[PDB]
Design a protein around this ligand. Sequence first.
Ligand code: ADP
Ligand code: ADP
Ligand code: BEF
Ligand code: BEF
Lengths: 266, 244
Amino acid sequence: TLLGFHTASGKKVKIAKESLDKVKNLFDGSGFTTATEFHQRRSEIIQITTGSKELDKLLQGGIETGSITEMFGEFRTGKTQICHTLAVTCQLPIDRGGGEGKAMYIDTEGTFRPERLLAVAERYGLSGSDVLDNVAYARAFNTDHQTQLLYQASAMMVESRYALLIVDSATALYRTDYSGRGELSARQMHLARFLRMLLRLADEFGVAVVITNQVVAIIAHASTTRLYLRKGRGETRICKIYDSPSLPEAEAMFAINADGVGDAKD
Amino acid sequence: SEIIQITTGSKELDKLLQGGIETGSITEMFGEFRTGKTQICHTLAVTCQLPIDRGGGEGKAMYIDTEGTFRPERLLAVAERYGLSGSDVLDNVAYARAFNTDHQTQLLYQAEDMMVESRYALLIVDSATALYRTDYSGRGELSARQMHLARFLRMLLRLADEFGVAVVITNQVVGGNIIAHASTTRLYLRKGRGETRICKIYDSPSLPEAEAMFAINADGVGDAKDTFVSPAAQKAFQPPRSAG
Ligand SMILES: Nc1ncnc2c1ncn2[C@@H]1O[C@H](COP(=O)(O)OP(=O)(O)O)[C@@H](O)[C@H]1O
Ligand SMILES: Nc1ncnc2c1ncn2[C@@H]1O[C@H](COP(=O)(O)OP(=O)(O)O)[C@@H](O)[C@H]1O
Ligand code: BEF
Ligand code: BEF
């Protein structure tokens, strides 16, 4: 039993046994409506801002809740920085572009820094002590611990209201392919079950699931929105819509300032 | 009733099918990812509301989605493309999301009564196999799930034969395939070079096995120019207005 889900401040998060028994039936009555009712229901989907105007205009609002957003790219392209920015912007009010919910950060590469959270909170004018208490951080060392963290996340999401679930490099613990053959099936199964559990959580709790994928120079669901991060010339970073059920392939520009994601300061 | 054929939005695809999607039978569209299955379904869900002279079916559309990829924005886009009022187009489409095989099967029971009440012309089952391809670890359940899919296809055939609706099911491609037996028309969608999307008549009792090219523009399919309740879905088929 490793360290479970702690907060960015360091204190341990305690879970009631009723919540554990309430989510064990998970991972195992809707009717016909007119397309107008469903289009209205999609207009009610809370979308979390990213701090960048051009990025929010590219996504027509921001990170959509209820689905999986997969940000992939090369090293030092802004995935972890965008995750740190979202982990604080999700606590903003709905009128300010937030989700009014706590954040959840599953780190697999040891690149979690509460200092960036404090910086972006000072940017948006929030209490630095409150934003660190509304972010449940958990470090994962292997795939089994990752899935156990997902189980603990399902247990936690019922007591308190969460709006964002971050999986920083979900493939970091899976891309340890030092073995020859054989593991390419078991690891694929584990990753597929992990993605399906993420989809189940996103559908059940309406939480925006944002996952990070390292690309050197997977089985994405049809509803998954895929973003590709690339470095341009200078500080200008380019985000492209690789695949989206509702958005066509387009590009936008953004930058990473000391306070997080923003527009390119030319 | 006489057989109506629905315009697919692409001239080459309409001439390939000698009119378009045939009603009363099953049309199985299968292919890889990002091949145009969901986009063709979205285009058909609006083109089936056109008058018979314009290549429509003069009936409401039914969209049973299983992957969360139903966007009425595409319907509004293709309705503006065909010059139809978006309100009447979105009001004549009954949408339902299925989460498991049991729900996907039970939705057709309600669909029967819905087609009894109001006139429907198109029943879309987007990824009818996605909930059945949940092999996961049970990659050999076979007859356990083969009997459920058999009853699902039997109900699809029953509805298509009784109400004369065009049943279009989507299949994802990477004991005997009962889908190949239950489906009359079979289209294979492949990705050529670039936006070159190749649609091939893989099997048809009347249409020859030929191929055609098409693309997915911002207004739908086109040619490369070289318990379970129902609220307002119970309303009758309202013919779409012009709004232009
Ligand atoms: N304290 C900081 N102030 C401003 N920019 C920073 C700071 N720390 C990192 N960055 C920027 O963020 C980028 C790091 O991206 P990161 O998200 O860590 O890559 P990855 O997606 O591989 O995790 C660097 O290019 C750097 O310019
Ligand atoms: N709004 C849009 N404008 C232009 N092209 C689009 C739009 N939405 C999707 N597309 C194109 O349609 C394709 C999606 O095909 P789709 O039918 O969703 O795949 P599948 O058959 O796996 O469901 C993408 O490759 C994309 O290029
Ligand atoms: F911290 Be990362 F995603 F490289
Ligand atoms: F939208 Be899919 F992949 F049918």
